[PDB]
Amino acid sequence: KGKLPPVYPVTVPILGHIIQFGKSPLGFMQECKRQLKSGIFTINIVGKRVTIVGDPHEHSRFFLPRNEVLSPREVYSFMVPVFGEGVAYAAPYPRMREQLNFLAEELTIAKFQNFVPAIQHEVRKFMAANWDKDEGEINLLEDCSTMIINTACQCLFGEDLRKRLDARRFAQLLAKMESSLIPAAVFLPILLKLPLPQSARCHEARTELQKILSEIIIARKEEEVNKDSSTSDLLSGLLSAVYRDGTPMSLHEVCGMIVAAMFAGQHTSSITTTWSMLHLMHPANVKHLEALRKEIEEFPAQLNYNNVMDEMPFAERCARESIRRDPPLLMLMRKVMADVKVGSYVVPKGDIIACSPLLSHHDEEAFPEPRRWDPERDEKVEGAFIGFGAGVHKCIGQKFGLLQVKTILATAFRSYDFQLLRDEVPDPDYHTMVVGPTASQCRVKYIRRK
Numbered sequence: 001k002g003k004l005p006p007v008y009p010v011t012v013p014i015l016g017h018i019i020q021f022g023k024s025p026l027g028f029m030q031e032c033k034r035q036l037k038s039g040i041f042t043i044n045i046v047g048k049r050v051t052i053v054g055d056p057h058e059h060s061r062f063f064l065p066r067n068e069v070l071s072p073r074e075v076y077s078f079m080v081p082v083f084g085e086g087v088a089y090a091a092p093y094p095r096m097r098e099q100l101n102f103l104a105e106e107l108t109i110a111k112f113q114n115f116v117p118a119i120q121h122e123v124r125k126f127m128a129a130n131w132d133k134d135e136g137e138i139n140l141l142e143d144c145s146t147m148i149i150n151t152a153c154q155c156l157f158g159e160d161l162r163k164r165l166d167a168r169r170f171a172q173l174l175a176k177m178e179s180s181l182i183p184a185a186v187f188l189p190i191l192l193k194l195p196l197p198q199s200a201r202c203h204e205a206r207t208e209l210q211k212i213l214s215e216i217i218i219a220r221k222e223e224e225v226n227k228d229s230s231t232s233d234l235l236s237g238l239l240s241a242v243y244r245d246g247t248p249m250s251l252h253e254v255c256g257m258i259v260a261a262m263f264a265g266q267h268t269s270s271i272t273t274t275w276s277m278l279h280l281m282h283p284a285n286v287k288h289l290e291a292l293r294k295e296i297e298e299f300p301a302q303l304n305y306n307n308v309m310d311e312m313p314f315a316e317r318c319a320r321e322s323i324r325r326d327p328p329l330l331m332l333m334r335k336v337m338a339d340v341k342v343g344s345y346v347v348p349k350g351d352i353i354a355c356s357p358l359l360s361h362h363d364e365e366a367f368p369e370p371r372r373w374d375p376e377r378d379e380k381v382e383g384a385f386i387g388f389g390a391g392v393h394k395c396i397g398q399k400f401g402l403l404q405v406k407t408i409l410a411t412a413f414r415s416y417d418f419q420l421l422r423d424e425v426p427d428p429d430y431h432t433m434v435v436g437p438t439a440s441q442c443r444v445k446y447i448r449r450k
């Protein structure tokens, strides 16, 4: 056609479709697609046009154009109080890319040397403290989420940082920053300009984190004179980065990339672990639990890099399929800065364009019987899996996240079995920013494998 995507009619004035979307994100999107006879279509969120790239065959039209054409900056305006002014997506595109590359470099597999033991240490410490009886009842999502913050901190931060800012206090500062976020501001940008009590809190937590970082940096320069230590961590990595123009990252920027890394990795990784365990313990999946048991059957007590990286293909499939079925990020978005072709249409300058892992992961051609968790499945449409994104803004933490998931799975199932206290795997809870299993349905019985 070369014209605009078909518009889905608005029946609710002012609000547009946001209500029907919350009620049933997948159901609503699939209904639009059916009724409009197009995988590319435009919905309306509080007056803003959102064009969905809902055909897995057209994913490349979303993930591949340059920032200058499809930009994430405006979509992330509401996180500026957390990352900081001029940090990540708020910085000019070449500088954004530089800061993101500096972070990515700290999460490459060449940094993973002592991560496996760090993760195992923290996981065993947690299990010993909280899974300390022959059997007992626990909330698996809460416990996975506590292990992820502990493990991430143990891997990424040297012992000195941890003595001043341990995983508990770090989680508290981050939860105070996160608590302040108003993602509605994507569609109601007037919010970003208002005095809100949120802003004061957020600024508070961030400035306290940045104070702690500066104090750590000053202390480290002193251990440098003494040659007591030479700590190599996430912080030292970003500290040594130098931009193309010859200058270093400011403290502001360093702090902001640390916050982005920690925000990003916490919920997604915790959720992926939780789903993966929930599926593995369910009676319908005994064959898959068997397979994981076989994979790890001959592993040593103290795992190494090679065991997790190279000898857990099935665990990795489990993690990936969990993300496939229940993607923690439902909608990836960009601001359209200039007219782009998508499918047989032109998406106009000023639209938000979106591509939905939720929608695409449930395309029946790409993923037959998509509600069936099957780690042995393989995509049947090229590039249909987008749980880690793709192209210009593809996930830079994927290997680190999967490292943690797989290690937790090997560590946990070595020492325990688990029983779901429900007939079914929990329902996904779509009411949060990062989507996981319904927290109240995640009660499980652990059983110590004596």
Ligand code: HEM
Pocket: 072, 100, 103, 107, 260, 261, 262, 264, 265, 266, 268, 269, 272, 323, 328, 329, 332, 333, 386, 387, 388, 389, 390, 392, 393, 394, 395, 396, 397, 398, 400, 401, 402
């Ligand atoms: C299993 C866990 C994870 C999942 C499912 C996940 C998913 C994703 C997705 C879907 C995107 C693309 C976002 C978009 O298109 O707008 C993304 C990008 C990103 N992820 Fe992850 N992520 C995970 C773990 C992590 C971790 C552990 C980190 C950091 C430690 C991280 C850092 C990032 C960053 C910084 C981006 C932005 C990259 C850019 O704009 O170039 N992620 N991730």
Ligand SMILES: O=C(N[C@@H](Cn1ccnc1)c1ccc(Cl)cc1Cl)c1ccc(-c2nnc(-c3ccccc3)o2)cc1
Pocket: 021, 088, 183, 186, 260, 261, 263, 264, 265, 268, 329, 330, 331, 395, 397, 433, 434
């Ligand atoms: O968590 C959000 N963004 C993270 C995503 N992430 C996590 C791990 N890897 C990526 C993020 C990305 C890049 C960077 Cl530098 C930092 C972080 Cl913390 C996030 C942000 C916004 C939304 C969001 N905004 N609007 C919606 C929305 C709107 C309508 C319907 C459904 C969702 O979601 C969702 C997740």
